[PDB]
């Protein structure tokens, strides 16, 4: 079928984190960081699962996800790799924490 109920809810949640409403503190996760330009030539060493919301949606669009748990897995993996790289005293972790809050309650309202 074209996106099961759980997966459709994923489409909506992802869409929200991608909406300009959150963009002000969601842009770090829209697309993968420009590590080479950022001076971060050690990015692929630390980040073993480089994932972003666009790729989460991409994979969702290819319907490679079976359930919203797989979505949750991939989206949270994005926030997870952020915490791997950036120490607690950085913008991207504070933005990750806040965006984690919204996404958390989005999935929390999502019934399974």
């Amino acid at each position: 079928g074209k996106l099961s109920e759980q997966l459709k809810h994923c489409n909506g949640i992802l869409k929200e984190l991608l909406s300009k409403k959150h963009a002000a503190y969601a842009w770090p996760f829209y697309k993968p960081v420009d590590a080479s330009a950022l001076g971060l030539h050690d990015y692929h060493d630390i980040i073993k699962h480089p994932m972003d919301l666009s790729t989460v949606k991409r994979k969702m669009e290819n319907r490679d996800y079976r359930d919203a748990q797989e979505f949750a897995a991939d989206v949270r993996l994005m926030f997870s790799n952020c915490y791997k790289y950036n120490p607690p005293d950085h913008d991207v972790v504070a933005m990750a924490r806040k965006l984690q809050d919204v996404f958390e309650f989005r999935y929390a309202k999502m019934p399974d």
């Binding site: 950022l38 971060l40 950036n86 120490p87 991207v92």
Partner: peptide, 12 residues
Amino acid sequence: HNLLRIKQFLQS
């Protein structure tokens, strides 16, 4: 981690 390298997101 302890440090390594920090993302250049300082005032972006």
